[PDB]
Design a protein around this ligand. Structure first.
Ligand SMILES: *[C@@H]1O[C@H](CO)[C@@H](O[C@@H]2O[C@H](CO)[C@@H](O[C@@H]3O[C@H](CO[C@H]4O[C@H](CO)[C@@H](O)[C@H](O[C@H]5O[C@H](CO)[C@@H](O)[C@H](O)[C@@H]5O[C@H]5O[C@H](CO)[C@@H](O)[C@H](O)[C@@H]5O)[C@@H]4O)[C@@H](O)[C@H](O[C@H]4O[C@H](CO)[C@@H](O)[C@H](O)[C@@H]4O[C@H]4O[C@H](CO)[C@@H](O)[C@H](O)[C@@H]4O)[C@@H]3O)[C@H](O)[C@H]2NC(C)=O)[C@H](O)[C@H]1NC(C)=O
Ligand SMILES: O=C(NCC1(O)CCN(C(=O)OCc2ccc(OC(F)(F)F)c(F)c2)CC1)c1ccc2[nH]nnc2c1
Ligand SMILES: [Ca+2]
Ligand SMILES: [Ca+2]
Ligand SMILES: [Cl-]
Ligand SMILES: [K+]
Ligand code: NA
Ligand SMILES: [Zn+2]
Length: 806
């Protein structure tokens, strides 16, 4: 209950929300049904429209008008945004030649350039090009400021997870808004789009820009607007705020548009009805920019034009029904649509089995338009698992489709022709970024980047220190003229050992054998040099990875590869090798098929053994440097050392062998040599971070050999492919993956076919940033290049997506 019998006189869009039950006048009061009786009368004037006509010029101030054309309006701060154009012979902002903004040009009393965030819902990336004819204002920002061809949203590509990711720099799994609709088992509460529960602060984790700004003494406009408040009024409210006295004037603001998402849902992303919403949003940008010009703020304010996600073509007839797969369909709750999340309808039903449910949804129909996963098996790039609000069972839906429980759900809710929410690598889901002002660069194109990175930059722009978040601070310095953040490389925490030959073959008792008994001076001197690292500049191109946690490991050098071998985990943390364009693929000789060789540099106590693999009927093993890419028959013996061995399910060796025997060569061929760093990942608690040893849930039977949840590779080469990988002068090029180490290939529906038909597709699905791998390994890569650190950070956030062009 609100005692709504107070007043909004002189309080319209107050910046400090008042406490119940005195009535409110803030831009959110409508949503709380708590505005004063006179809020509409006083704060939402509409009289005479939003534009000055030639005959309103010089007029006498009539307070009933929505905006003014009187002589005193400039200094009252409440002219219609086009006042100067109509009444003072000024030009619109969009008609003006664009001019570099080298320094902020601000009125006396402005301590910093204000930031204005102009956020647009459902603004698909290709709109910039495709709708350019009807968006002159937006096109001017884009082409005159700093722009990316697109920005990558987070998964799910839904509204709240993405807006709250912009605001916080955090993955939805960390911020808590993991969908538009959520159930939290601990609260025993439900969050929905429509309703009051979403206003409860317990849903919202992390620290959004407005709170960061506030705590650090930077005043913020209130970010959120009630639906009923028309765009024109929001714009005027922002401009009014910017005329306030210095001590009361906020430094950061947000505008939000419900369009083009609203129409996109009805009409599809490119429906002819979409031209009008795009014109309208442009008109609004024009109003903003014209109003900034009027206040002499158009060369002072940094403006960000940013979308939450794109829009895809989706119709009712493209719906998969869980009733066609499950007979038990009433015992489950489905969160539906462009993603699927499944839980038990009742906690008291012990006839519920996720295992049998996944199986009943796995590869059942030839053209199946979703794939079920246990959340921990989702591609690690989605970072979508570490929250009690994310159900164990998840369905990734093909672009253009929906998933629903029963057909009755669809027709007793075709209405819609567009939707969004799919995998964040999907082209149709990509969105927009433009930065324009003194702090952003002039006429500059930057590569696509992830929306998780912007929070850092908005802090940079405002002189704020960002709260801990998922961006890599410095990775977007290239967007900025100044205000850059100069990061320093994290310090190495563990230094390696360099073991020499310390053990005799007979001290090992590992149950391993090798037919290596078939045994010069020119070449004994030679292989000695190889074990001291004579070829190390070839195979270790960027320096060694730094270990950022306390542990015990050995650098091991070889002719063809170098490794950092962990005495704690009994396997390398990383194995680094270079494969030039000219390299030859050989087979494993017949005699050496089961060959494993004790490593005379490493104690038996800190080694794996063959016996455990023999006894473990589930687990086989593979190698990190592949025997197939050995440089010579004699170097091949090195690839079979017990210290190059890692545990692998037979089902995964199919994947791994095909990568090593076929794809490394192809990449060397296509990219003019590659440098490969490969290794194991342990993430049993699926938090995207390196497990400590006491977190491993699985060992090779009867041993302390820990089983990875995943295997990674970072594959680097020269961005200028006319230069070989091992002699690159300039910028680098990288693609990486984090393949799940699974006992079956259920994920890949074509897996009973030859590896050339499915392995690569699986790998592409599990593409990753080097930065994802760093989090999962406590390693820091690219420590020694000739490249600047900021450029290396960008490189480390790059994701190779395998989508066609935008
Ligand atoms: C992306 O970036 C983010 C941001 O940096 C990364 O997330 C951080 O990671 C840290 C490491 O995991 C983690 O640090 C821990 O802090 C714990 C206290 O955290 C509270 O306070 C902070 C600060 O204000 C707050 O942000 C937290 O908010 C969480 O929880 C609320 C509700 O309670 C949510 O609303 C909110 O969304 C957020 O939830 C998310 O994080 C939690 C983890 O806290 C997840 O569980 C959720 O699923 C959700 O995703 C908290 O209110 C602190 O308790 C930890 O300390 C333990 O471990 C240390 C080791 O240093 C040890 O010294 C202690 O003994 C202690 O262990 C004790 O508890 C154990 C478990 O109960 C128990 O087994 C032991 O016996 C001990 O008693 C730890 O230091 C930090 O909280 C999060 N921050 C955020 C915002 O998410 C994220 O890693 C990045 N992701 C990637 C892939 O890089
Ligand atoms: O609009 C929808 N629902 C209503 C809504 O809550 C109204 C209030 N609101 C707002 O005014 O937000 C400003 C803002 C702008 C930017 C930010 O972040 C920042 F600042 F970082 F950009 C930031 F946190 C906040 C957000 C949207 C909606 C849309 C499309 C859909 N499709 N399917 N379902 C859907 C539901
Ligand atoms: Ca949205
Ligand atoms: Ca972990
Ligand atoms: Cl959702
Ligand atoms: K075995
Ligand atoms: Na299969
Ligand atoms: Zn939408």
């Amino acid at each position: 209950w609100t005692a709504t019998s107070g007043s909004c006189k002189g309080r319209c869009f107050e910046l400090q929300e008042v406490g119940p039950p005195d009535c409110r006048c803030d831009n959110l009061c409508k949503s709380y049904s708590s505005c004063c009786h006179d809020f509409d009368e006083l704060c939402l004037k509409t009289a005479r429209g939003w534009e000055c006509t030639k005959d309103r010029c010089g007029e006498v101030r009539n307070e009933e008008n929505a905006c003014h054309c009187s002589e005193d309006c400039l200094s009252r701060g409440d002219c219609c945004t086009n006042y100067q154009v109509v009444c003072k012979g000024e030009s619109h902002w969009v008609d003006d030649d664009c001019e570099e903004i080298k320094v902020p040009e601000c009125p006396a009393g402005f301590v910093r350039p204000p930031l204005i965030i102009f956020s647009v819902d459902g603004f698909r990336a290709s709109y910039m090009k495709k709708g350019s004819k009807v968006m002159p204002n937006i096109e001017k920002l884009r082409s005159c400021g700093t722009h990316a061809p697109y920005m990558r949203p987070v998964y799910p590509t839904k509204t709240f997870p993405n807006l709250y990711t912009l605001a916080t720099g955090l993955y939805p799994e960390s911020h808590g808004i993991v969908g538009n609709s959520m159930y939290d088992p601990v609260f025993d509460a439900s969050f929905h789009l429509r309703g009051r529960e979403k206003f409860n602060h317990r849903w919202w984790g992390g620290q959004p820009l407005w709170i960061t700004a506030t705590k650090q003494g930077v005043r913020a406009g209130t970010f959120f607007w009630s639906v009923s408040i028309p765009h024109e009024r929001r714009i005027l409210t922002i401009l009014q705020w910017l005329s306030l006295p210095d001590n009361e004037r906020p430094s950061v603001y947000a505008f939000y548009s419900e369009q083009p998402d609203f129409s996109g849902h009805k009409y599809g992303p490119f429906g002819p009805e979409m031209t009008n919403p795009l014109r309208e949003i442009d008109k609004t940008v024009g109003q903003l920019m014209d109003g900034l010009k009027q206040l002499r703020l158009h060369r002072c304010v940094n403006v960000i034009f940013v979308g939450d996600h794109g829009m895809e073509d989706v119709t009712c007839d493209r719906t998969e029904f869980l009733s066609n797969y499950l007979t038990n369909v009433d015992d489950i709750t489905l969160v539906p649509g462009t993603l699927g999340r499944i839980r038990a309808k009742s906690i008291n039903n012990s006839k519920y089995d996720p295992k049998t449910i996944i199986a009943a949804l796995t590869c059942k129909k030839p053209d199946q338009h979703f794939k079920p996963y246990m959340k921990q098996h989702l591609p690690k790039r989605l970072h979508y698992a570490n929250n009690r609000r994310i159900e164990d069972i998840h369905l990734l839906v093909d672009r253009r489709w929906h998933v629903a429980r029963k057909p009755l759900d669809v027709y007793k809710k075709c209405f819609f022709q567009g939707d969004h929410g799919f995998d964040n690598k999907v082209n149709s889901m990509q969105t927009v970024f433009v930065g324009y002002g003194p702090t952003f660069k002039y006429r500059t194109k930057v590569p696509p980047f992830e929306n998780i990175e912007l929070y850092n930059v908005m802090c940079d722009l405002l002189g704020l220190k960002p709260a801990p978040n998922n961006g890599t601070h410095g990775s977007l310095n290239h967007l900025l003229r100044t205000n850059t953040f100069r990061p320093t490389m994290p310090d190495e925490v563990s230094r390696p050992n360099y073991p020499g030959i310390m053990y005799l073959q007979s001290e090992f008792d590992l149950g391993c054998t090798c037919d290596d008994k078939v045994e010069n001076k020119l070449e004994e001197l030679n292989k000695r040099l190889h074990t001291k690292g004579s070829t190390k500049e070839r195979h270790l191109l960027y320096g060694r990875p730094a270990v950022l946690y306390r542990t015990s490991y050995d650098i091991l050098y070889h002719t063809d590869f170098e490794s950092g071998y962990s005495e704690i985990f009994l396997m390398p943390l990383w194995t680094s090798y270079t494969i030039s364009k000219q390299a030859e693929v050989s087979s494993i000789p017949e005699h050496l098929t089961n060959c494993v060789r004790p490593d005379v540099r490493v104690s038996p106590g800190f080694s794996q053994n063959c016996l455990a693999y023999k006894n473990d009927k589930q687990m086989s093993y593979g190698f990190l440097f592949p025997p197939y890419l050995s440089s010579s028959p004699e170097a091949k013996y090195d690839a079979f050392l017990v210290t190059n061995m890692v545990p692998m399910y037979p089902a995964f060796k199919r994947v791994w062998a095909y990568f090593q025997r076929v794809l490394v060569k192809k990449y060397a061929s296509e990219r003019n040599g590659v440098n490969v760093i490969s290794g194991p990942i342990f993430d049993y608690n699926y938090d995207g971070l390196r497990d400590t040893e006491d977190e491993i849930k699985q060992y090779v039977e009867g041993s302390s050999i820990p089983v990875p949840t995943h295997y990674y590779s970072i594959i680097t080469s020269c961005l200028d492919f006319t230069q070989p990988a091992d002699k690159c002068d300039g910028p680098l090029s990288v693609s990486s993956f984090i393949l799940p180490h699974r006992p079956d290939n259920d994920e890949s529906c074509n897996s009973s076919e030859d590896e050339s038909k499915w392995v690569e597709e699986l790998m592409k699905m599990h593409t990753a940033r080097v930065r994802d791998i760093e989090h999962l390994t406590g390693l820091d890569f690219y420590r020694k290049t000739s490249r600047s650190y900021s450029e290396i950070l960008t490189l480390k956030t790059y994701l190779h997506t395998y989508e066609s062009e935008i």
